[PDB]
Each structure stands twice: as C-alpha cells, then as structure tokens.
C-alpha cells in the first residue's frame, strides 16, 4: 500500500524541498536571512548510503577530517524513524518542525528534543538532500521491525550553539543583493540543481 519512493523520485524531491521550505517560510519569530533551501541531489546519494545501514544515529563522516560533499565542509543531519504506514515525506519533516514545541526562541532552552526543527529552519542551510531505507530493524530501536528510516542531509550543516535563524522582518538581511519570494532569500545560482 504504502511506497516508498527512491532518491530520484521526481515527486519525492518537490515533496522534500516544498514541505521544508514552506515551515522555513512560514517561521514566527520571523527571519530576516531565511535562504531558498532546493534539492541536491549528492547529499541524497549521501544520505541513502548512510539510510541503508539502519542505524538511529548520526552518519559517521559528516564533519572534518571527512568531507562527502565536495561543496560543504560540514553537513547537517535530520532522522525519522517509524512504521511504512505512517511514513510520508510531510509525517517525517512535520514531526522534526513539531519539536518546536518544546523549543523557546528568546532562550535558545529545549525542554525535551530540539535539533531536527532548528536544523529545518536553519537559515543558512539552502541544499537538503533525503532518502528512505526499508529496515527490517533499526538499531537504538528494540521493538520496532519492518521499518521507515528516513534521513535527510543538508548544506552547510546548522546547529551550531546560536539561534537557527536571524530574527527580523522577513528578508531584510539576505545576502548580497538577493530578492525574496515567500518570505525566502533567493539567488539563481545557490538555487540550480
């Protein structure tokens, strides 16, 4: 019933790249530096290869002394992990951007688990990749089996120790002179695939 799309499933692409620039759009407090986010389509290669080892925990190689990406130096990282029936690309990216919940803007504090919703909405992040693996199990889960294990990775990577974004109205500090569309700093050349 439920599928489970490839890397480069036209639909699943748009699905990943329209699902997280809507929440990046959509964002309170607004953002004055929200970059465009599109697909690429090396850190999905990045991401299938690390989905297939069934692991609930973050790829190995992500920052230096390894580089995967010939473009970033360090990549940032979401995981989701769950049954095939609930899985879609909107479940898993809206289950990240949900964790903002627990999250208080003017402290930066995280009341439970906060690092998938900063990593959506991180605002010098503009090139996401994602894949989803069939894991018959996921290790760091006991009883789950027959599983949805869906990573996505992103360029520059984010979560550092500071806010995910620039708080401001909305596009008043995008880079260079870049015009803005839905609330997002846009640029022709960050944003070809």
Known sequence: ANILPDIEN???????????????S?????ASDMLYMTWDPALAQIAKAW???CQFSHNTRL??????????????????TGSVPIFSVSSAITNWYD???DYDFKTRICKKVCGHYTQVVWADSYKVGCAVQFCPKVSGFDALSNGAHFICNYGPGGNYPTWPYKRG?????CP??????????VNRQRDQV
Do not use: M
Request: aromatic share 6%; with cysteine.
């Open 176 to 185: 260079n002179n870049d015009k803005c569309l839905d609330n997002l700093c």
């Open 10 to 24: 036209e639909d699943f692409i748009k699905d990943c790249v329209r699902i997280h620039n809507k929440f990046r």
């Open 169 to 173: 109205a909305t596009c008043s500090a």
């Open 63 to 80: 920052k230096p002394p390894h580089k995967l990406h010939p473009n970033f130096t360090s990549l940032g990282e979401n995981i989701w």
């Open 99 to 101: 964790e903002i919940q």
């Open 26 to 30: 959509e964002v309170k407090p607004t």
């Open 51 to 53: 989905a297939s080892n």
